[PDB]
Each structure stands twice: as C-alpha cells, then as structure tokens.
Design an enzyme around this catalytic site. Structure first.
Site, PDB file in Angstrom:
ATOM      1  N   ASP C  60     143.015 -17.731  16.539  1.00 21.87           N
ATOM      2  CA  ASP C  60     142.118 -16.985  17.404  1.00 21.87           C
ATOM      3  C   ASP C  60     140.688 -17.437  17.153  1.00 21.87           C
ATOM      4  OD1 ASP C  60     140.125 -14.693  17.826  1.00 21.87           O
ATOM      5  OD2 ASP C  60     141.879 -13.954  18.918  1.00 21.87           O
ATOM      6  N   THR C  93     139.384 -15.722  24.087  1.00 24.40           N
ATOM      7  CA  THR C  93     138.112 -15.780  23.384  1.00 24.40           C
ATOM      8  C   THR C  93     137.738 -17.231  23.169  1.00 24.40           C
ATOM      9  OG1 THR C  93     139.191 -15.725  21.228  1.00 24.40           O
ATOM     10  CG2 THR C  93     138.626 -13.629  22.247  1.00 24.40           C
ATOM     11  N   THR C  94     138.699 -18.004  22.674  1.00 22.26           N
ATOM     12  CA  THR C  94     138.674 -19.448  22.784  1.00 22.26           C
ATOM     13  C   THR C  94     138.233 -19.891  24.175  1.00 22.26           C
ATOM     14  OG1 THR C  94     140.980 -19.402  23.429  1.00 22.26           O
ATOM     15  CG2 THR C  94     140.508 -19.465  21.103  1.00 22.26           C
ATOM     16  N   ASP C 390     146.452  -9.258  18.655  1.00 24.28           N
ATOM     17  CA  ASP C 390     146.161  -9.725  20.003  1.00 24.28           C
ATOM     18  C   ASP C 390     147.265  -9.309  20.959  1.00 24.28           C
ATOM     19  OD1 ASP C 390     143.647 -10.937  20.395  1.00 24.28           O
ATOM     20  OD2 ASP C 390     144.266 -12.755  19.344  1.00 24.28           O
TER      21      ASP C 390
END
Lengths: 49, 524, 522
Positions: C60, C93-94, C390
C-alpha cells in the site's frame, strides 16, 4: 548443520557467553545480523521451530 | 589607516542610525520589501502561498495577515505595518492585503517627495489632510445598501466577494454553505457573534462534499450505546462524573469488621441511586469534561444512558449554548428547566474518524457548525481561514450597512476626487496630496499584475470610462478582454467599513513610520 | 561601524517564480517514482527500514509514503493525499499519487510557458467536475439487475482490490472470508469491532476466521492450567472490577484495639473476596474475563469448582466479546443477573504456534468476528493486516454504496476518450489543458503494462482504437497481455475509490500550481 552427519555451530554471546548447538532456530536467534533479509530468515527459523 | 575616530563611545555594541538617511532610504526600502512580499497576495487572480514556520509547520495561505504572522521580522517599521495590518484583520477581516498595499504605495510615493525635498512634517500634514478628505468623500460612493436580514440569496451574493477573493474556484458551494450558516444563526447572545460559528476539519471526500450542520460536532469516542431520540434529553456536568471527592485529604476510616462490606456496598448503592435519579428525569445522554467513574458508566449502560468525554471548557460551553441547558457543577439535580433538548444525537463515521453529532433543529437560534471535507489538511487550513474571513465579512456587514463597489472602481473614484481637490489646495503640500491620490492606483495595479495584463493602459481606460461618473465600473478579470468590467452587475462588492478602516489604519502606519528620523538598536 | 539591516532572519531561504514551481513539479515526480512500480496485479511493494532498525515492507503506497518521511514541502501535500485516500477508500492511494504526479508532469511543459496558474487550475476544476459527472453517469448498480447476490458484488470487489498485495494467490479464499465477516459487521459498520490477530507461524492458507472472539493473550497465575479448558455450553461472565485483596482499591488506614478485632479485620477482607467469588459462582456462569488482574486465590476457587477464568484481558477484545455473546460488561459483582451473562455455542483454548489462545464461538447472534492470521513472517503480519484492512474498509464502502465500475484502468481510458472529445468543443487555451488532462490521465494502464513488461504503446493504441466504438469496459488484461472486457472478467472496483482519487488529485494540482515561492525558517 543438516543431517546426522552434519556439524553444528558454536555461538558467542554479546556478554561473552558461549553456546554450542545444532538447532537452526537458535543459530539464527543468537546471530547479530544487520542486513534485513538475514533478519527475515532468522524470524523464519524461529517461526518454523 | 585602520583607525578612524568615534566622538561618542556611548554604546556597548549597538546600531546608531541618524541623519534622515534611514528614513529616506532604509526604512522605505523595508516597507517596499513587504510590499513586494505580498503584492501577489491580493487578487481574485492572486494566487495562494505557502510558508513554513520556524517550527517546520506548513501554511498554505492567501490571506496576508496569516502570512505576515509567520515571518519573524526584525526591521522595526516593518513590524509597524505588520502589526497594524494584524489589528486591522482583528477588526474587519480581509483588508490586510489592502492595507499592506496601501502602506507600500504611500511610503514609496512619499519618499519621492522627500527626495524632491518636501518637509517631512509637511508630508505628514498633506497625508493627514488627504486621508481625512478621502474619508469625507467615501460615503458618497455607497451603492446597493443590502438590507435583507436573514435571506440566503442576498447574503450569498454578498459574501461571494470575499470568498472569491481568497478562493477563486469554489464560490458557489462556500457561498451557499456560509449563507446557510449565517441565516441559521439568529441574534441570541447578541448580533451574530463570530464565535458562534465553529469549524471542524475532516480529511477525505473533496471540497464539493463539505456540508453544514445546524448543530455541533465532536471527534471523540463513546462509552455505552449509540442512540438518537427525536426527544433527546441532555444533561451537562462540569464536575467529573463520579462521586464528589472532597478536595481535602479525606481518608475513609473504619473501626470494626462490617465497615468494609457496608462501605463498598453503600458506595455501589449510592452511585446507583444518583444515576437513577438522573435517569428519572428522563435524561438519556450525559456530557462531562471531568473524569468518568467506571461504576457510573456501568450503571448508565444499565439505564441506557449516553456519555460524552474529555471535552475542554470551551467545548462544554459550546454544547451548553447548543442545547440551551445550563451546565451543572453539582452532580445531583437533573433539573427539568435547565435540561437539554436536541433534535438528534448519534455517532457516525467520516474519514475513519469517530464523530459525535448533535443534529438539531432550533427556531430560537443555535450555534451551528460547518463540516469541511477534502484531501489535504493544509487546504483545510486555507479554506477554513477563508470561510472565517467571510464570516467576519458578514458580521461587519451586519455591524452597520452599505456595500461599496469593489474591483478598484471605488479607489479610482477616490483617486480622481482627491486629485481634483488637490489642485484647489494650493500650497507646497499640493504635491503631497497629489501623490497620495496617485497612490490608490496601486490596487488596480496589483490586480493587473496578478492578472498579467498591461497595467498602464488598463488604468488609462479605467480613468477614461470613470470620467463619465460610471462609479460602478471596475477592473475586469479576463485575458480575452484586458479592458474593463462593470462591477455592480457583476456583484463584485465590498463593505464600507472595511475600506474606511483599512484606509485610516494605512494612513496611521504611514504617518508613524515617516515621522521617525534616527534609530537606536540594542543588540538582540 | 553600522551595517545594513536585514529583512528576515539570516539564512532565510527564498526562491520565487517559475523555477520554484518547476522544482516543486520535479519533486512530485520524484515522489511518484518511489511508488510508480507499486500498483498492479503484477505490481510491486517496497521495503523501508527506519533509523531504529525495524524493518517494514509494504505494498500500500500510503503506508510507504508515511515511512518515507518527506522534508520537501510540496511532496508533503502528496503524502497527505495518501493519508486521505487511505482513510477513505483504500488501494489506488498508489493510483492517487500517480494521477497527481502525472497531471503535474503533463502541465509542466505549459508551465514553461508563462501561463498564469489560475487558468490551469480553472481548467483542472472544470475537467474534474465533468469527469466525476461522467463516472457517476456510467456508474453501474446491480440491485436493479437480476443475477446479483447481495454479496457477489462484494465478493468480486474483494477479488479485484486484493489481487495486488502480498496475498494475491489466496484471493479466492480471503475474499470469501472477508465478505462473510463484514456481513456480520452490520449495522455499526465500524472497523474496531473485528480485530485482527497476528498469530506467529503457520502458512497463511491456514489463517482462520472465527465466528467469535479469540485472545492472543492470557497470563499465568497459580492454577490457570489446573481448571478444565473445555466448556461445551458455557455462560460468559464479564467483570471489569478486579478480584484481589484490596490490591488497588480505596486507600485507608485502620485502627484496632482488640487483637480479636484485628483477626476479624483480616477475616473480613478475605470475606470480601469470598463474597465476590460466591456471587460469581452462584451466578451460574463458568467463564470469567477481567480487564483488571485476577487474584490467584480466586483462580484456585474457580479451579476447585471447575470454573474457567482469566485476567488482564485487553479492553478492546473484551468489548468484542461482550458484543459477541450479547452480555454486558459488569463492574458491580453484586448487581449481577442472568440477563447480562453472555452465552456462546462452545468455549475452548487451543495452542497455535506455541502461543496460548482462548476460543469461544458459534454464537448465532454475534455481530463481530475476528481473524486469526497465520503466517510465517512477522512482516507478513503487518503486510497482510494492511491488505486485509484495505479489503474490509473497501467492502464496507461497497455495501454502503451499490455502485461498481470496471477495473484495469478502463475507467481512466473512458474518461480520457470522453474528455478528449469534449475538448474539441471548447476553443482556446482551455482546449490544450483539457488535452493534457487526458494525456496525464491515461497513465494508469501504462504503469500497469510496464510493471507487466509489455509494449504498452501497442496496448494503448489498440485500447484507444477499440475503445472509440466497441465497448465501454475494455481494458488491460495482465495474463492475456492485451485488451479484454475486464467487467465480464470481473475486475470490479467501487466507483467511490476512483471518484475520490480524481477529486483529490485535481485539488492537489490546484494547490501545488497555486504556489509561486517558499520561505524557510531555521
């Protein structure tokens, strides 16, 4: 350290203590590694044991 | 060589300044430094700024007062104008930008006259008389005396000016939400106190989704259940929710056996009785900033009571005002009359953040809160700062009245009128008043520079169209047409009081800084 | 000897204008490259070790950026966006960071031209609003449709979101566990209920989902091994109050003349504890848990009378338990009644990897479960936990919002096509900015294919050509190494993730580009 014909290790403690053993978990536990994946293998052996 | 003389060794190591050289050059240069520092600041075309403090904290900002607060400055009259603008902000809201620009322009044009040899004191006289004349002529410029008390549309249209100024992208949303805030708050503790509005920051869910609650909010946990009753009965207690410990060192004592059994049992029983009496008045929710006894919360769970925790004094004051119920330092008396009343209270999740909500409907008036949603907390700081400045703007509007035509148009009229009065002045101060009148071109100039169009002919056309009494026409914001716009139809207004006060404070700062001639500086 | 008076502190750094802005853009790109490899079904994870020597691997991106303590200011905004998206919707988020950096990258050449930033940010805002509206239009619900089970969308959502993190080849398994688990979370919907238990050792294929509560904890007192450790149909008693001889209760001095009274005093203390224990037993329960420490003697009595007990249990797990077996935590032993007594289908405590755990499960009405997470690596514990977190939070969002969109970047390609076509309508400077918007936006498939080692130009070109006309949900397929209708391939991500991503990236570009100069203070 593997096998009945195998040969074991002898560790030197930080405080100057000694220990002779064949158990790989102990071998890696007493080791003072710094490279990370060495730590990962140490934890590997601890978990497996 | 290597050895000039000193006729005065009075100083143990310090800076002596004298000979008007500092006033003529160095002080003026410092003021111009500030002027350049935040020239880009003001403007709808003005673009934002970031600064980190001495303690490495980010500050995205467009407001001038905030940015000046974050530059730890050393030249004295720099501090003069800084804190002048600071207090101005403390008085009206936006205008920090305005007043700093005024100061820069007035100082820069005054030093030119000083170089052309006008008396410093006479410069003072001219500037003062010019400022007073401008004050006299200003009220004659008021248009659109917006009078509607509690409508949403008029106030939204009005607050659009400040919001647009310090944030150019999102006028509609912020306008509507802040207007909803203003109308929701009536005169309850006296004429729409700025402090009556609270702001909460919640990251995630970008700005468009930010909303406003007619109640007030808390980012804290909960201890028992989570329930809302359409008839929610709230109890407030400044005292910690526990058996009242004597302040004196009171050590419980026993003498015989049964004391232990009876003492523990009685402690239990009387906590039970106290919380029961609280429940008897029907209060289903209790709040306190003091410590909570585990026994108390246990019994509350037994009786289906809601608990709220770790509130600071200001927080419980807010809640007191929200539910209109008086906080009780005595744990006992859940009195009916001073007991809470809320539309709904519950716990919700936003942005992985436990949130306590006091969702409300209050005709008598309540202190509401705005919820800010979006990614970057620094943007939260900027946007909430802008919203609070807008709230101040609305408050000042409510103070008396009388919007004035913004977009520099007012200031162009000021320039023309002051100049015209200038040639009827005659006396060596005529140059002083003429330069003061010239100074107001700084604002439209700044708007141009942050707009990136050729300022000079913009100002010229502005003058020309202002030769016909078109007091409502001002500087446009458009690259296609770098010419002109009529402010009144565009609704780009601003407050009488703000401009008046900014002008007076800028005048005061100028007259102060010009006045001092020689400086003395002990080593820091 | 006078000197010039400074404006600000000595060494107050300042840097104004186009160089400042382009420096910020480059810094954002640098941050991107630290995360560029990460996302992808064949994507990537990083290992970062702190100055303290504690290793930490992560896939993440937000976690990584948290570890990469950024000093440069502008990049701090990007990392904050990482936190925001992490708290909001999960992986991507990446993707969020990549979108932000690529927006800035495409804009920067035009920034070389002296364009006032506000025009750029206005174009950005307009484009983003239009993009969000387009996404919401092409959003897909299922409860209108016929062939959806109320969970199948959730199962496939977990399927999609998972297959980038460290457990990718066990997705068919973990999706079922997480969906069934979150189905129990109703209706509080908050993550604190279901704990995560990082048991050491074991293969993660052996990781356990229990319809109940377990403890990685206990503590040895005298008899804790003596009492029976099976209770087939037990009653759970939950004590917050400690059980010990006035160990930390009210502090009191006592005065006693008669020796016999002193005897009576000590007897009465022990009678306090015996009274509490009798209340506990006569309650009829057999299992007692305590936040506070347990007296050894009480343990002995439970052992003699075949009750199980334990002390010092962490409060969070106790709350889990009480919510599970329906009982309410108690502090007054005296007020005890059967109503507050939790019940469980069966209670146990069984070894896993040397550790002593406790089990009770099978409660038919239990709205909270827990993950026993086997795994041979301590680092797997944190990484799997992050991935699971997540998964849980994204599936929660999915339950909240019955809106799904295709994965594999197909959304981004559709937006690219739509925005590019729209750009033709608006003449002038806005057109170029919209074009750059689309050209930046297309990045997601490119990074996917690059981490897949393909000629993403052939993939991109075929993508655009096929995606002009032939169907909405065509996008990158990793294994077939070319386009596919990923929607039918069940690459399903909640719309909220991409929507929030785009909004955050847009305002990030606004913020960064809205800066001309920087001031530093020692």
């Amino acid at each position: 350290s593997l096998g009945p014909n195998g040969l074991d290790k002898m560790m030197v403690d930080k405080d100057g203590d000694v220990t002779v053993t064949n158990d790989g978990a102990t071998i890696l536990s007493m080791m003072d590694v710094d490279h990370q994946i060495a730590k990962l293998m140490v934890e590997l052996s601890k978990s497996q044991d | 060589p290597k050895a000039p003389g000193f006729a005065q060794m009075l100083k143990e190591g310090a800076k002596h300044f004298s000979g008007l050289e500092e006033a003529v050059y160095r002080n003026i240069q410092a003021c111009k430094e500030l002027a350049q520092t935040t020239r880009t600041a003001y403007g709808p075309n003005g673009m934002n700024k970031m600064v980190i403090n001495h303690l490495e904290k980010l500050f995205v900002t467009n407001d001038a007062a905030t940015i000046l607060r974050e530059l730890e400055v050393q030249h004295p009259a720099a501090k003069m104008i800084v804190m002048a603008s600071h207090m101005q902000e403390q008085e009206v809201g936006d205008g920090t930008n305005f007043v700093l620009v005024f100061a820069g322009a007035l100082l820069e044009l005054a030093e030119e006259l000083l170089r052309i040899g006008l008396s410093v004191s006479e410069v003072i006289e001219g500037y003062e008389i010019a400022c007073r004349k401008a004050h006299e002529i200003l009220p004659n410029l008021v248009c659109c005396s917006a009078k509607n008390l509690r409508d949403i549309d008029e106030v939204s249209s009005l607050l659009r000016t400040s919001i647009m100024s310090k944030q150019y992208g999102n006028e509609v949303f912020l306008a509507k939400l802040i207007a909803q805030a203003c109308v929701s708050i009536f005169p309850d503790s006296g004429h729409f106190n700025v402090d009556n509005i609270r702001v909460c920051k919640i990251l995630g869910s970008g700005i468009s989704s930010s909303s406003v609650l007619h109640g007030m909010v808390f980012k804290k946990e909960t201890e028992g259940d989570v329930t809302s009753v359409k008839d929610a009965k709230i109890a407030v207690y400044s005292c910690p929710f526990d058996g009242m410990i004597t302040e004196t060192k009171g050590t419980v004592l026993i003498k015989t056996a049964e004391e232990l059994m009876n003492f523990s049992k009685g402690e239990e029983n009387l906590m039970d009785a106290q919380v029961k009496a609280i429940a008897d008045t029907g209060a289903n929710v209790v709040v306190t900033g003091g410590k909570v006894a585990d026994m108390a919360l246990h019994y509350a769970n037994k009786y289906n009571i809601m608990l709220v925790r770790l509130n600071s004094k200001w927080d419980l004051r807010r809640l007191c005002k929200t539910v209109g119920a008086t906080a009780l330092p005595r744990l006992t008396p859940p009195v009916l009359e001073e007991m809470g009343h809320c539309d709904s209270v519950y716990l919700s999740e936003v942005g992985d953040t436990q949130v306590v909500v006091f969702k409300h409907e209050k005709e008598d008036g309540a202190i509401s809160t705005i919820v800010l949603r979006g990614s970057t907390d620094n943007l939260m700081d900027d946007i909430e700062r802008a919203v609070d400045d807008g709230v101040n703007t609305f408050k000042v509007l409510t103070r008396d009245k009388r919007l004035v035509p913004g977009g520099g148009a007012t200031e162009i009229e000021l320039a023309k009128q002051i100049t015209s009065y200038g040639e009827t002045c005659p006396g060596l101060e005529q140059y002083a008043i003429k330069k003061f009148a010239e100074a107001f071109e700084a604002i439209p100039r700044a708007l141009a520079e942050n707009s990136g169009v050729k300022a000079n002919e913009v100002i010229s056309k502005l003058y020309a169209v202002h030769q016909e009494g078109n007091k409502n026409v001002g500087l446009d914001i458009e690259a296609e047409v770098p010419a002109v716009k009529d402010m009144l139809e565009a609704g780009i207004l601003d407050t009488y009081l703000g401009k008046y006060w900014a002008i007076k404070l800028a005048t005061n700062a100028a007259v102060t800084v010009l006045r001092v001639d020689q400086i003395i500086m002990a080593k820091p | 000897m006078p000197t010039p008076v400074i404006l600000l502190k000595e060494g107050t750094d300042s840097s104004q204008g186009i160089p400042q802005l382009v420096s910020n853009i480059s810094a954002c790109q640098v941050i991107a490259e630290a995360v560029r490899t990460t996302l992808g079904p064949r994507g990537m994870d990083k290992l970062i070790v702190d100055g303290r020597g504690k290793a930490t691997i992560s896939n993440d991106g937000a976690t990584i950026l948290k570890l990469l303590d950024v000093v440069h200011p502008a990049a701090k905004t990007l990392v904050d966006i990482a936190k925001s998206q992490d708290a909001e919707v999960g992986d991507g988020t990446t993707s969020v960071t990549l979108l932000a950096a690529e927006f800035l990258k495409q804009v920067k050449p035009y920034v070389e031209e002296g364009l006032h930033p506000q025009i750029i940010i206005r174009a950005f805002r307009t484009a983003t609003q239009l993009a969000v509206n387009k996404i919401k239009e092409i959003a897909v619900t299922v409860k209108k449709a016929d062939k959806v089970e109320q969970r199948k969308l959730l199962e496939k959502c977990a399927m999609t979101a998972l297959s980038s993190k460290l457990i990718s080849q066990q997705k068919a398994f973990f999706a079922k566990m997480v969906v069934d688990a979150v189905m129990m979370l109703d209706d509080l919907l908050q993550l604190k209920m279901i704990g995560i238990k990082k048991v050491q050792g074991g293969a993660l294929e052996d990781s356990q989902l229990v319809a109940g509560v377990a403890f990685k904890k206990t503590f040895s007192y005298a008899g804790f091994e003596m009492q029976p450790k099976k209770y087939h149909n037990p009653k759970i008693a939950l004590l917050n109050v400690e059980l010990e001889l006035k160990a930390e209760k009210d502090n009191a001095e006592i005065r006693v003349h008669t020796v016999e009274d002193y005897q009576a005093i000590v007897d009465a203390e022990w009678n306090i504890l015996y009274d509490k224990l009798e209340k506990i037993h006569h309650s009829g329960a057999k299992v007692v848990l305590s936040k506070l420490p347990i007296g050894d003697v009480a343990t002995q009595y439970f052992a003699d009378r075949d009750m199980f007990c334990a002390g010092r249990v962490p409060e969070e797990d106790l709350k889990r338990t009480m919510m599970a077996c329906g009982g309410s935590i108690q502090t007054s032993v005296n007020a005890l009644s059967a109503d507050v007594l939790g019940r469980c289908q069966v209670f146990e405590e069984t070894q896993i990897g040397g550790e002593r755990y406790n089990f009770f499960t099978g409660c038919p009405k239990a709205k909270t479960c827990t993950f026993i997470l086997r795994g041979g690596a301590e680092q797997f514990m944190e990484e799997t936990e992050r991935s699971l977190h997540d998964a849980i939070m994204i599936v929660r969002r999915a339950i909240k919002n019955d809106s799904v969109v295709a994965g594999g970047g197909a959304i981004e390609m559709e937006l690219s096509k739509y925005l590019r076509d729209y750009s033709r309508t608006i003449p002038g400077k806005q057109q170029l900015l919209i074009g750059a918007y689309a050209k930046a936006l297309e990045i997601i498939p490119r990074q996917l294919c690059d981490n897949a080692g393909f000629d993403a130009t052939n993939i991109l070109n075929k993508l655009r050509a096929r995606h002009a006309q032939g169907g909405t949900w065509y996008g990158v397929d990793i294994n077939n190494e070319d386009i596919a209708d990923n929607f039918e391939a069940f690459v399903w991500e909640p719309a909220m993730v991409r929507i929030n991503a785009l909004t955050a990236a847009s305002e990030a570009a606004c913020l960064i580009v809205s800066v001309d100069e920087t001031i530093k203070n020692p």
